[PDB]
Design an enzyme around this catalytic site. Structure first.
Site, PDB file in Angstrom:
ATOM      1  N   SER A  32      22.552  21.678  67.649  1.00 53.60           N
ATOM      2  CA  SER A  32      22.784  23.006  68.502  1.00 53.60           C
ATOM      3  C   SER A  32      21.434  23.881  68.565  1.00 53.60           C
ATOM      4  CB  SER A  32      23.667  23.808  67.398  1.00 53.60           C
ATOM      5  OG  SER A  32      23.265  25.168  67.888  1.00 53.60           O
ATOM      6  N   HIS A  63      29.278  21.629  78.763  1.00 53.76           N
ATOM      7  CA  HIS A  63      28.452  22.008  79.600  1.00 53.76           C
ATOM      8  C   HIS A  63      26.981  21.044  79.131  1.00 53.76           C
ATOM      9  CE1 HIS A  63      30.757  25.926  79.066  1.00 53.76           C
ATOM     10  NE2 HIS A  63      31.550  24.988  79.532  1.00 53.76           N
ATOM     11  N   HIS A  85      31.789  16.460  67.355  1.00 59.88           N
ATOM     12  CA  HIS A  85      31.843  16.730  66.101  1.00 59.88           C
ATOM     13  C   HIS A  85      33.425  16.556  65.707  1.00 59.88           C
ATOM     14  CE1 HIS A  85      28.857  19.520  67.693  1.00 59.88           C
ATOM     15  NE2 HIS A  85      28.494  19.796  66.541  1.00 59.88           N
ATOM     16  N   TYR A  87      35.076  18.261  63.650  1.00 60.95           N
ATOM     17  CA  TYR A  87      36.121  19.681  64.183  1.00 60.95           C
ATOM     18  C   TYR A  87      36.395  20.012  65.481  1.00 60.95           C
ATOM     19  CZ  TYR A  87      31.879  21.994  65.520  1.00 60.95           C
ATOM     20  OH  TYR A  87      30.545  22.238  66.464  1.00 60.95           O
ATOM     21  N   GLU A  88      36.130  19.014  66.346  1.00 60.54           N
ATOM     22  CA  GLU A  88      36.692  19.282  67.615  1.00 60.54           C
ATOM     23  C   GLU A  88      37.793  18.408  68.232  1.00 60.54           C
ATOM     24  OE1 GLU A  88      32.184  18.609  69.683  1.00 60.54           O
ATOM     25  OE2 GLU A  88      33.057  20.549  68.683  1.00 60.54           O
ATOM     26  N   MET A 218      27.959  20.020  59.974  1.00 58.78           N
ATOM     27  CA  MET A 218      29.339  19.622  60.202  1.00 58.78           C
ATOM     28  C   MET A 218      29.142  18.251  61.019  1.00 58.78           C
ATOM     29  SD  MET A 218      31.172  23.169  61.054  1.00 58.78           S
ATOM     30  CE  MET A 218      30.910  24.309  60.117  1.00 58.78           C
ATOM     31  N   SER A 219      28.146  17.408  60.886  1.00 65.71           N
ATOM     32  CA  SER A 219      27.989  16.221  61.793  1.00 65.71           C
ATOM     33  C   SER A 219      26.695  15.292  61.101  1.00 65.71           C
ATOM     34  CB  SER A 219      27.477  16.620  63.077  1.00 65.71           C
ATOM     35  OG  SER A 219      26.677  17.640  63.313  1.00 65.71           O
ATOM     36  N   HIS A 256      28.136  32.681  64.252  1.00 57.36           N
ATOM     37  CA  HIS A 256      27.177  31.501  65.450  1.00 57.36           C
ATOM     38  C   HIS A 256      26.325  32.412  66.084  1.00 57.36           C
ATOM     39  CE1 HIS A 256      26.790  27.986  67.333  1.00 57.36           C
ATOM     40  NE2 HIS A 256      27.240  28.128  68.376  1.00 57.36           N
TER      41      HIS A 256
HETATM   42  O1  LIG Z   1      26.154  27.571  56.713  1.00 55.41           O
HETATM   43  C1  LIG Z   1      26.517  26.713  57.252  1.00 55.41           C
HETATM   44  N1  LIG Z   1      27.963  25.931  57.064  1.00 55.41           N
HETATM   45  C2  LIG Z   1      28.360  24.944  57.627  1.00 55.41           C
HETATM   46  N2  LIG Z   1      28.202  24.420  58.886  1.00 55.41           N
HETATM   47  C3  LIG Z   1      26.870  25.225  59.252  1.00 55.41           C
HETATM   48  C4  LIG Z   1      26.521  26.253  58.868  1.00 55.41           C
HETATM   49  N3  LIG Z   1      25.481  26.910  59.394  1.00 55.41           N
HETATM   50  C5  LIG Z   1      25.302  26.063  60.421  1.00 55.41           C
HETATM   51  N4  LIG Z   1      26.347  25.213  60.538  1.00 55.41           N
HETATM   52  C6  LIG Z   1      26.684  24.142  61.688  1.00 55.41           C
HETATM   53  C7  LIG Z   1      28.169  23.807  61.767  1.00 55.41           C
HETATM   54  C8  LIG Z   1      28.630  24.413  63.345  1.00 55.41           C
HETATM   55  C9  LIG Z   1      27.290  25.156  63.822  1.00 55.41           C
HETATM   56  C10 LIG Z   1      27.672  26.551  63.926  1.00 55.41           C
HETATM   57  O2  LIG Z   1      26.315  26.962  64.684  1.00 55.41           O
HETATM   58  O3  LIG Z   1      26.180  24.744  62.974  1.00 55.41           O
END
Ligand SMILES: O=c1[nH]cnc2c1ncn2[C@H]1CC[C@@H](CO)O1
Ligand SMILES: O=c1[nH]cnc2c1ncn2[C@H]1CC[C@@H](CO)O1
Ligand SMILES: O=c1[nH]cnc2c1ncn2[C@H]1CC[C@@H](CO)O1
EC number: 2.4.2.1
Lengths: 288, 288, 288
Positions: A32, A63, A85, A87-88, A218-219, A256
Site C-alpha cells: 500500500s 485502479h 489480499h 481479505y478481498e 495482511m499479505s 486507514h
Molecule cells: O495495525 C495493523 N494491523 C493489521 N494490518 C495492518 C495494520 N496496519 C496496516 N495494516 C495493513 C492491512 C491492510 C492495510 C490497511 O492500510 O494495511
C-alpha cells in the site's frame, strides 16, 4: 496450487514473453502506497492485470491494478502495483499466482513490500522494518498457498521456510541504509500475517506481541512462501504505518487515513531504498 | 459479504418492515439457554426464520429458531432466539446476516449474549462476564465475516475493533449490577472465539489462558464484528456455564448437560439484568 | 460430516464386511515410513482405497494407498497404510472418513501414528513420543472434522476432548517400553497440528514452543477427534524425525530426506512396540 494448472502458468508466462521484450530478473510486489516505485522504471511497458490470460483481476477498485515492466537502477524488473489480499476474497492460489508466473518468466529474486502495523514499541510510525522472519498464522490453520497436489516442476512437497528472507540481502540492506547514513535505523524483526480486513483489538494485539511478532499485516507471506517453493531469492520490508494499541486505557485506535504514511516521505524513502538496493541483487551471470 | 448482495439485505429489511409495525432500536441475540428473554417482551410478534426472504434457516433442530419482535422494559427490541454457529456449517456471511438486516431495519444497538467456558479461575460457574474485549481466533486465519468485497453502504474496508464493546454501556452495566446490589460481582474480561464443535483439551485450555482469554466460546464475535462495521453500539455478557479443565491430573471434563446452567437462576438472572439494562441504552432521539 | 451421509458410511462398512471375513477390532493408521507394520499381519487381505465405494483415493502417489486387513500379535486389526492429509487438498471430512467406517466396521480402538518434528529440546531425533494431549490449531480456526450437522448415531454435538488419548493404554505403553527395557525412554508430551505443507520457520517454531507443544505435525488430530466422537479408545505415538530449529544463528533447516528416520531402526522400533502393544488392548469380550 488448486484452481490453475502448470500449463495455465506456462500459457500466461509465454503470453507475457511474446508481448513484452523484457525478460525480468527481479519481481517487485509493492505494498500500500509504496507503488510510486513504478514511476522510477525505464523502458516501462505497462500491462493491465485483466489483459493477461489467467491473471486474477483486482475487483473494480483495481485502479492501481497493473503489472509494469522496465529497468530500475540496473536490473530489468517487473512490478506489481496493487496486489491481491486474502481479505478481498481471493483464495490464496490467486493471491500468489503472480509469483509462479514471475518464476516461469525467469525471475530469480522477489522483493516484497507492505505497510504493516507496529507491535514492537521500539518501532515508531514512518519506520521501515526488515522482515527477517514471519509467522504464518493463516497457514497454521490450513491457509497455505501450497495446499493441494504439489508440482515437482515448481518445487518440493515440504519446502522449508527456516530460510526465506535471504541473509546476504539483509546484510546489504542494513549496510545500504548505513551507506545513505540515514536518519533513523533500518528496523529488523518478525512479521505476522493476520487475514481479517478489520483491525486488531487490544486483546489481539497483546497475543501477537507475546507471540513474537513485531509488525502485523495482511499479505506478503503467501507470496514469500510460494516464491521460496520455486527457489526465488526473497527479502522484504514493512512500512510501519501505525503503532498498534494496548488496553489499559487508550484514546486512539487505527484507521486507514493513516495511509497518509504510505505516500509521505516514508513511502518515497523506501522507494529510493528499494531502487538503490537493485544494485545489490546478484545478476544471473553468476558475476565474475 | 460473499453470498448475499445489498439488495438481498434491503429486500429482507423491507419485507420485515411491511410485515411488522415494529421499528426496533435494540437487537438482542440470545445465547444458549438465555432465550427465555423472549418471554418478557410485549406486543410480541414472532417471525419464523424460514418465513423471512433470505434468512438462513437453522437446520431441523431450529426449534428455538425465531426472530421475535416487541417492546422490553422501554425499548422496541427484536430478538434472535437461537442463533447460527460456524460449527453447524454456516459460512460466516450467513451467521452474521441478521446483524446486517437489523441495521437496515433501523437498529443502533446490539446486546449479544452467549454461554462460554470459564478460563479465568476467578470465574466460578453461574458467573456472568462482561465482554470488554475479544480474541478473534478464526479471524486470524481468514475466518472473518468481512472477507470479500466491502460495501461502503455498510461500512469501511478496514474497520477498527480496538473499540467495539461500548465503554459507557459497560459503566452502566457494572453500575446496574451494583444497583441490584447483586450477590456475586459482574465479572469482566476478554472473550476468545474458538470454532470447533468439540470441547477444548487441557493443552488447548492452557494456550488460551496464556493467550489472555477469560471465557471461551463458539460465536458472538462474527456478530460483534459486523455490527461495528455497520456502526452499531455493542456490548455483551457471557454466562460461564462451566470451568475449563487443566492437565496435572483431573477427574472431570465438560459436557452439554452443564447447560442446566443456561436455564437455572443464572439464566433468568442475566435476563432480569438484560431487561433492566434496556433502561440504560440511549434513545435515537439524542435525549435532551 | 459434510460431503458424506450416514448411509454412505453404512454402504461402505457393509461393502467391506461382505468382502472380507475379518471383523477388525483395532484400526491402526500408520504415519510416514512406519507403514512397514503391514508386513507383520497374518491372514492379510489387502484392499485398494479406490476399490472401496466412497473411500477417498490418495492422488497418483497413493502407492502406499491401501487398507490392509489381518491379525497382529493377537487382535484382528485393519491398517491404513498411507493416510490423507489436509495439506493435499482433502477437506477434513475425507481425511477422517476411515475412522467413521472403522467404527461401523466394529472397531473400538484406534492407535494412530505419525512422524512429527521435535520441539521439546529433551527430544532427540529417532525418539518416540507418547501423545498425552494435542493442540488442534486448525480446529481453533474452524478446521474441525465435526463441522456441520451432527449425527447422533455417531455421537454428541459437543464431544469433550479433555480425554482422548486413553490413560490406561498410556500406563501400558510406558510399562511395555520398560518391559523391553529399551535404550532411550518412551517420551510423552503434547502434539500440535499445523496444516501447511511447508515447514515451520524459526519464528513459528518459537510460538509453538511457548504454546506448549512438544512435537509438531500435520495430521492425526482429525482422526483422533472423530474417533472419540464415535466412542473409540485412542492412543498414539509420534516418531520424532527431526529437531525443529530456532533463530539465534543456525546452519540447518529441515528436509524430507530426514524421512530416512521413518524407515531406519526407529521405524521398525515403533513397529515392534505397536505389535507387542496389541497384547495390551482390552478385548470386546469384557475379559473375565
Ligand atoms: O495495525 C495493523 N494491523 C493489521 N494490518 C495492518 C495494520 N496496519 C496496516 N495494516 C495493513 C492491512 C491492510 C492495510 C490497511 O492500510 O494495511
Ligand atoms: O468450555 C467451553 N469451551 C468452548 N465452548 C464452550 C464452552 N462452554 C460452553 N461453550 C459454548 C460452545 C457451544 C455451547 C455448548 O453448550 O456453549
Ligand atoms: O518439523 C516438522 N514440522 C511440521 N511437520 C513435520 C515436521 N517433521 C515432520 N513433519 C510431518 C509433516 C509432513 C511429513 C514430512 O515428513 O512429516
Amino acid at each position: 496450487e488448486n484452481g490453475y494448472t502448470y500449463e495455465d502458468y506456462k500459457n500466461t508466462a509465454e503470453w507475457l514473453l511474446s508481448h513484452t521484450k523484457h525478460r525480468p530478473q527481479v519481481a517487485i510486489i509493492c505494498g500500500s502506497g509504496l507503488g510510486g516505485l513504478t514511476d522510477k522504471l525505464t523502458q516501462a511497458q505497462i500491462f493491465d492485470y485483466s489483459e493477461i490470460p489467467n491473471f486474477p483481476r483486482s475487483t473494480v477498485p483495481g485502479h492501481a491494478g497493473r503489472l509494469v515492466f522496465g529497468f530500475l537502477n540496473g536490473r530489468a524488473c517487473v512490478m506489481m502495483q496493487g496486489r491481491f489480499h486474502m481479505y478481498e476474497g481471493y483464495p490464496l492460489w490467486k493471491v500468489t499466482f503472480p509469483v509462479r508466473v514471475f518464476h516461469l518468466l525467469g525471475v530469480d529474486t522477489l522483493v516484497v513490500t507492505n505497510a504493516a502495523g507496529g507491535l514492537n514499541p521500539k518501532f515508531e510510525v514512518g519506520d521501515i522494518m526488515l522482515i527477517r522472519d514471519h509467522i504464518n498464522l493463516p497457514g497454521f490453520s490450513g491457509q497455505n498457498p501450497l495446499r493441494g497436489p504439489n508440482d515437482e516442476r515448481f518445487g518440493d512437497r515440504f519446502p522449508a521456510m527456516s530460510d526465506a528472507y535471504d541473509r546476504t540481502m539483509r546484510q546489504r540492506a542494513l549496510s545500504t541504509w548505513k551507506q545513505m547514513g540515514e536518519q533513523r535505523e533500518l528496523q529488523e524483526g518478525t512479521y505476522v500475517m493476520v487475514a481479517g480486513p478489520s483491525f486488531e483489538t487490544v486483546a489481539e494485539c497483546r497475543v501477537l506481541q507475546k507471540l513474537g511478532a513485531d509488525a502485523v499485516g495482511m499479505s506478503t507471506v503467501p507470496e514469500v512462501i510460494v516464491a521460496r517453493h520455486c527457489g526465488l531469492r526473497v527479502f522484504g520490508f514493512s512500512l510501519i504505518t501505525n503503532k498498534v494499541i494496548m488496553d489499559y486505557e487508550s484514546l486512539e485506535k487505527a484507521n486507514h487515513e493513516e495511509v497518509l504514511a504510505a505516500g509521505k516521505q516514508a513511502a518515497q524513502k523506501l522507494e529510493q531504498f528499494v531502487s538503490i538496493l537493485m544494485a545489490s541483487i546478484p545478476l544471473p551471470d553468476k558475476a565474475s
